[PDB]
Amino acid sequence: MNIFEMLRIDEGLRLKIYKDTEGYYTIGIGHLLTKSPSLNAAKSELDKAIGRNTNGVITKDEAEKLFNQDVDAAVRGILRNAKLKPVYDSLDAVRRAAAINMVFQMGETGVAGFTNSLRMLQQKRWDEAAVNLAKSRWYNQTPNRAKRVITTFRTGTWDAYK
């Protein structure tokens, strides 16, 4: 298991524009297009992202290309963030994947607001971080996904994904 397989499980794959769990136009493996209610706005963002006239549909290779870019961007957003980087550097390889998963889902700014959780993660107080991570809109809106990510931070194993 690795970050790509983990996110592929959590995000799924859909080849036509769809609305994510928040109601936002998305495509592929959780690639958010726009927060705008306008499907034409989404289609225009999609053509822009892919470099051709898609009319709302992309191929599997194209979905995986955006996915690679988004995983890369999530990692790079962690490393450029003064609040995220030192926590990430302190973690083992499996828990680092949980950190990337969170940034991928909610963005650099969102995660960086888990101030108390981040501190507990840096101190390796795993059970306490897990409890604090769960007291969040994140956990209440997407409990099954959030539990899997939290279990990964708690245990440092891939058990929630096997």
Annotated binding site: 32, 104, 117, 132
Closer to Cl ion by Cβ: residue 97 or 146: 146
Residue ranges at the known binding site for substrate: 32, 104, 117, 132
Q: What size, in residues, is the chain? A: 162
Q: How far apart are CA 15 and CA 22, in angstroms?
A: 19
Give the largest CA-CA distance in the chain: 49
DSSP-based three-state secondary structure for 36 = coil
Binding segment for Cl ion (CB under 5 A), chosen from 43-51, 53-61, 85-93, 108-116, is 43-51
Binding segment for Cl ion (CB under 5 A), chosen from 46-54, 83-91, 121-129, 131-139, is 46-54
Closer to Cl ion by Cβ: residue 96 or 145: 145
Q: Is 11 a catalytic residue?
A: yes
Position 77, amino acid: G
Would you count residue 145 as binding Cl ion (CB under 5 A)? yes
Q: Is 108 a catalytic residue?
A: no
Structural tokens at position 76? 């790079």
Mention every residue, 6+ apart, whose C-beta is less than 8 A from residue 14: 26, 27, 28
- Describe the strand order of the beta sheet including 14-19 as a list of residue ranges: 14-19, 25-28, 31-34
Q: How far apart are CA 125 and CA 29, in angstroms?
A: 32
Closer to Cl ion by Cβ: residue 43 or 145: 145
Would you count residue 133 as binding Cl ion (CB under 5 A)? no
Q: Which of 49, 99, 100, 160 binds Cl ion (CB under 5 A)?
A: 49
Would you count residue 148 as binding Cl ion (CB under 5 A)? no
* Residues with catalytic roles: 11, 20
